[PDB]
């Protein structure tokens, strides 16, 4: 079926939970043996969220190459994304090592450091220009260059230096700051505006390594971001945009990381975002 009318048909019939459970039943199951090794317990935020072995990002290190991060490679859309958990106190150096080694331009953050009164990720970037951060375990230096605070999101320019080679690179930090502590946003308008700002920066384009996207577990809000982006790109590429099947795209993405889209409300919100976004692209 088309999307917008399949949407109204699920709303009127109140069957979002059944649609979402079907997706959960059909989703791929691949091994994640490296994630479960005892030496990696303090590298995982949640015991039930792990990268598959076949798609995990490897650190360029001979001691321990493990990080909780997955490469989502979308062949028809010609887009790739790295989805990862919010960094832990003992993985902030690994996080920036990955950004460096994978040649990423941008980092997309969809959570606040504290939500619901608890810590959801480490404070892994510097908050003042004159107070830079040094990660001694991976030999990297990180400096805040500029910060632009807007009503729904903040964009930061960062300098990452490989202290071993003295090479430097500019990284863009795109921080969506207004996702509610409970539920999903009422309108997708600010989320779509944010997606378009990431696109306009070059951070999603083939001349760079894959964008790094995270929330707390790296599957819920993060899944919503890449699902909406890929679906909109396919609608632009194809002769028949109504042939884009958001459930089929989501199942394709779940071949590369488990659990993407965590609730039926997140699934409904993803439909809403793609529907509204397809009107703004055109032609109007
Ligand atoms: C768990 O409640 C869900 C179920 N569905 S439903 C009745 O299947 O349409 C709706 C989708 C949005 C969601 O909000 C959480 C609610 C309402």
């Amino acid at each position: 079926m088309e999307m917008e009318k399949e949407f109204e048909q699920i709303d009127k019939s109140g069957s979002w939970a059944a649609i979402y459970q079907d997706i959960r039943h059909e989703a791929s199951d691949f091994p994640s043996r490296v994630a479960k090794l005892p030496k990696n317990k303090n590298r995982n935020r949640y015991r039930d969220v792990s990268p598959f072995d076949h798609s995990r990002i490897k650190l360029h290190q001979e001691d321990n190459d493990y990080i909780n991060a997955s490469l989502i490679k979308m062949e028809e859309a010609q887009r790739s994304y790295i989805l990862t958990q919010g960094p832990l106190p003992n993985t902030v150096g690994h996080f920036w090592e990955m950004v460096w080694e994978q040649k990423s331009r941008g980092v997309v953050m969809l959570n606040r450091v504290m939500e619901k009164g608890s810590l959801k990720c480490a404070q892994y970037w510097p908050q003042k220009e004159e107070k830079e951060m040094i990660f001694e375990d991976t030999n990297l230096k990180l400096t805040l260059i500029s910060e632009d605070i807007k009503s729904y999101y903040t964009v930061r320019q960062l300098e990452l230096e490989n202290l071993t080679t003295q090479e430097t690179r500019e990284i863009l930090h795109f921080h969506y700051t207004t996702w509610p502590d409970f539920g999903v946003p009422e309108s997708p308008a600010s989320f779509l505006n944010f997606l378009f700002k990431v696109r306009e920066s070059g951070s999603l384009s083939p001349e760079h390594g894959p964008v790094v996207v995270h929330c707390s577990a790296g599957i819920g809000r993060s899944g919503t971001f890449c699902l909406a982006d890929t679906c909109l790109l396919l609608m632009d590429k194809r002769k028949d945009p109504s042939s884009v099947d958001i459930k089929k795209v989501l199942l394709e993405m779940r071949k590369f990381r488990m659990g993407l889209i965590q609730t039926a409300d997140q699934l409904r919100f993803s439909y809403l975002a793609v529907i509204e976004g397809a009107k703004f692209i055109m032609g109007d």
Side-chain angles (χ1 to χ4, degrees):
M1 196 185 316
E2 175 190 59
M3 191 170 30
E4 172 145 37
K5 291 185 283 154
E6 189 200 348
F7 179 86
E8 317 232 42
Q9 198 240 323
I10 302 169
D11 257 10
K12 74 170 170 50
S13 54
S15 47
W16 282 109
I19 302 300
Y20 178 66
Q21 260 304 139
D22 299 350
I23 288 163
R24 291 189 60 161
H25 180 70
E26 287 297 325
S28 302
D29 191 23
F30 291 114
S32 310
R33 285 167 210 130
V34 179
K36 302 309 280 171
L37 296 174
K39 66 175 175 162
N40 291 324
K41 197 157 180 179
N42 77 340
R43 290 182 185 215
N44 296 312
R45 186 175 285 283
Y46 303 105
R47 56 153 177 71
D48 58 334
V49 181
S50 299
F52 299 140
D53 296 320
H54 77 90
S55 55
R56 75 185 181 94
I57 301 293
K58 299 178 186 184
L59 306 172
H60 299 177
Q61 224 257 98
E62 42 190 25
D63 169 52
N64 190 341
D65 71 7
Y66 179 74
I67 182 169
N68 194 316
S70 308
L71 179 66
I72 302 1
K73 188 171 186 195
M74 301 305 288
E75 185 170 27
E76 186 189 356
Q78 286 293 291
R79 279 270 224 256
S80 296
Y81 318 83
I82 292 167
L83 270 63
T84 191
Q85 69 184 15
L88 291 156
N90 61 296
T91 70
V92 173
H94 307 148
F95 178 88
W96 288 114
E97 176 184 4
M98 177 176 65
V99 168
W100 183 268
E101 287 167 356
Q102 301 300 316
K103 301 180 157 55
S104 308
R105 180 84 190 293
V107 172
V108 174
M109 171 170 183
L110 304 171
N111 66 287
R112 295 167 299 281
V113 166
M114 180 166 283
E115 299 182 3
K116 296 179 184 182
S118 298
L119 294 173
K120 297 296 168 194
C121 89
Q123 182 60 55
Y124 66 86
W125 73 93
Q127 294 176 280
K128 295 179 181 303
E129 287 87 342
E130 68 277 11
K131 294 277 205 191
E132 76 272 17
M133 290 177 80
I134 295 172
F135 303 102
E136 296 185 342
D137 59 338
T138 55
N139 215 31
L140 292 158
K141 178 175 106 172
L142 182 66
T143 306
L144 177 67
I145 298 303
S146 73
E147 179 169 68
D148 192 355
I149 302 172
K150 306 276 225 301
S151 46
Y152 290 91
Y153 69 99
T154 297
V155 188
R156 309 181 177 93
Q157 300 183 302
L158 307 173
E159 182 202 64
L160 187 62
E161 183 180 347
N162 178 349
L163 292 172
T164 299
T165 67
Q166 292 193 328
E167 308 169 284
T168 66
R169 279 176 214 161
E170 182 186 327
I171 309 298
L172 302 180
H173 193 241
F174 286 92
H175 188 183
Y176 189 80
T177 54
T178 50
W179 195 296
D181 269 12
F182 289 96
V184 306
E186 184 159 297
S187 161
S190 57
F191 192 69
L192 287 165
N193 188 61
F194 175 77
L195 167 60
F196 299 155
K197 297 294 186 186
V198 180
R199 278 184 176 197
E200 288 177 3
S201 79
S203 289
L204 292 164
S205 300
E207 63 251 26
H208 301 293
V211 69
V212 172
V213 166
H214 78 89
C215 48
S216 191
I219 61 175
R221 298 172 199 177
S222 290
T224 300
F225 183 87
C226 60
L227 181 60
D229 184 52
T230 283
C231 284
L232 289 168
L233 211 50
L234 293 170
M235 288 176 81
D236 267 351
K237 215 170 201 255
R238 285 186 188 176
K239 289 185 181 184
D240 179 9
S242 74
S243 71
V244 173
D245 184 333
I246 177 167
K247 302 189 259 48
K248 287 176 177 168
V249 178
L250 179 53
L251 288 165
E252 179 66 25
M253 291 184 163
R254 277 194 179 216
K255 298 178 180 172
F256 300 92
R257 189 171 175 83
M258 61 172 68
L260 304 180
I261 309 301
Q262 282 179 293
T263 70
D265 258 37
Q266 281 178 5
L267 186 65
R268 181 181 186 274
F269 180 77
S270 300
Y271 273 73
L272 266 184
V274 174
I275 292 168
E276 187 59 25
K279 308 168 153 158
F280 199 74
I281 207 122
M282 316 183 172
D284 161 41

